[PDB]
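Reproducibility note. Readers wishing to regenerate the assembly model reported in the main text can use the exact inputs given here. Chain order matters: entities are listed in the order in which they were concatenated for prediction.
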Amino acid sequence: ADSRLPNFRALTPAQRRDFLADACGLSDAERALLAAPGALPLALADGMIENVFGSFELPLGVAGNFRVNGRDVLVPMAVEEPSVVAAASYMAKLAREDGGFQTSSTLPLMRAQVQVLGVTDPHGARLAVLQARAQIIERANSRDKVLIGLGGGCKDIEVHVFPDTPRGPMLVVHLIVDVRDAMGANTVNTMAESVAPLVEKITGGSVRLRILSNLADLRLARARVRLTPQTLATQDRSGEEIIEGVLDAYTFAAIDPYRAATHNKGIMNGIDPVIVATGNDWRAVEAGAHAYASRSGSYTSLTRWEKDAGGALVGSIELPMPVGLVGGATKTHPLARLALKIMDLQSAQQLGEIAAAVGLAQNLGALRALATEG
Amino acid sequence: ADSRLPNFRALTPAQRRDFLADACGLSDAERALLAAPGALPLALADGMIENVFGSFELPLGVAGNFRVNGRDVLVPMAVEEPSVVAAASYMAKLAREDGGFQTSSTLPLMRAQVQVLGVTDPHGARLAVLQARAQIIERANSRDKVLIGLGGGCKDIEVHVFPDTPRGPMLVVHLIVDVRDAMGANTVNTMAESVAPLVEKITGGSVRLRILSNLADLRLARARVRLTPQTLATQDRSGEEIIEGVLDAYTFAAIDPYRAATHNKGIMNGIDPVIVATGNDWRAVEAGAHAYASRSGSYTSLTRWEKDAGGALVGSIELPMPVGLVGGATKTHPLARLALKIMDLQSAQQLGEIAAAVGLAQNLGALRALATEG
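Running the prediction on these inputs yields the following structure tokens for the assembly.
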């Protein structure tokens, strides 16, 4: 596995495709899928969304040089904006000098909210629900033996109480569900529906919404990169000076929401195209990322940029990453399946980690460029 | 202009395309563009982003029944998720009973940030900059006579001071620029570069970042809808009961960020596909929307749902809407140009208003469904 892309700026799209096909060991059928338009026939698209009358193409590029937890990975990106793919590739190249990106993940835990109205003693009812947690978990897991056998399923519950609202008290049960390699929305929505009668019995209330939370802060991807001054040095600027410029740009985003919005937008320039190319739901990843960015009480940067004790630049990111390898468009779209093969993905967690590293690299590309522009 | 889509569930994609082509008076060439895949030849895609090796298709559907400020509009949506296009169409149908959606916009004002370091008297330097505002505005406008002649250009400046940061004091000049029908990023970035030497002279400091803000809170789209109880009544439920359920769901999103993230995600299910189909930058619209959602100190709902004095349900939305009709992918992508024709757009402002109405309708579809699910 080798993600270096020698001379890709000079190759034609056909030559880039043949190189990738060779590098990833794509079959002759998969190579054909890419060499002609229409990999998603309208008959397939017609079953994906409603009122289909055609298809809409995004350019599909590949970012090179990425290395994550010691393994090279080629990264397909479906996006319309110039500079994005080249900046990701270049920052990944610089990151190779320290051995690449280092990533980790929490378990793939999604929240399902069960909203209960009509309970006049919600704090006491919360204790009753928590006392019955084992029964509620068993009820949540009773319909999905396949997920259970994989090691997934509902693992825990939380209860949150909003005692004073314009609509009366609300008690909200969260089912915490390990969804393995799925995005998980339909799985956790169904579990929420399954536990509603039991929650109504325990609380005496009336269940209304039964729905996942897109603030997927129990399903986090993490990525870290370190670049020495010599790695960052250019003909015109020392690496030391570039590092100080990156730190000035980062602190600006940390203290000013007007800058943080642009700073985080740059991150999603890297993340969203990977999400789109793998057939995943880019609205869910956007909502989770930007909502997480405001968890402190102010909308701020999703990344951190620092200097370690020896003076090297260190970047880090932590953000919700609800993505899947199965289900939805990732199953039906022939090119989405091809994207997973190009990336050689083993789990949704791994896809989330690679995406977080691409977002971190994209952020660096923007900060480094903005700080070295004359 | 008529946006009703009779029997579209029963038609094939080819029949839907021929209907739309007839309804919008599409040319025979435009009809051909839609009837075969590959409306974006790789040679065109190769000039849009880097390392192009192919293209990636999204399903392209049309949401029907939308009526905005008294004018019917057909709405193309590029997205991968089921239920989205049908829910938007259905809620637009219900909105027709009150005459459709009512929308408005601010002027198309974008912020460019000019970050100044090294100023030890930033509050005093801010007064010096504000005193020189006329000179700075004239300097910002000196290179873009075409934009000026259209009525655009830099109209005002603000100065914000961060006197105590881990990197020293920062003084940030905002150029407030009317960008007419462009998204505006490259226009305002260039103006920021043009005023940097003058800002350095006035302040004695050193300009670092010169870059637009994606928190485009001076470029707002607004949309409102009203639905009576009889309009919302179903076979199984009174309109009165459905309205109370929508209000319960809305208040949940207003007080709980875990719900607000899902609630706002549903809005972007409506907005982003329009943005993608018109060749616009969906990361910019996402960043602006979700950052605006946290402006109060908590991440909360972008919409408001209320009951008016007679008992009708009233929904409203206000959010940044940086979009364009010219430049970027909206010029190069043949289907993006076709999307603008289908929508018959007269200004970027109008596109922003239609998108905000689609987001409001999409939100209602989710709240109404979640509240009427048994």
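We highlight two features of this model. Residues 348-372 of chain A form the longest helix (25 residues). Chain A has two domains: 1-106+219-373, 109-218.
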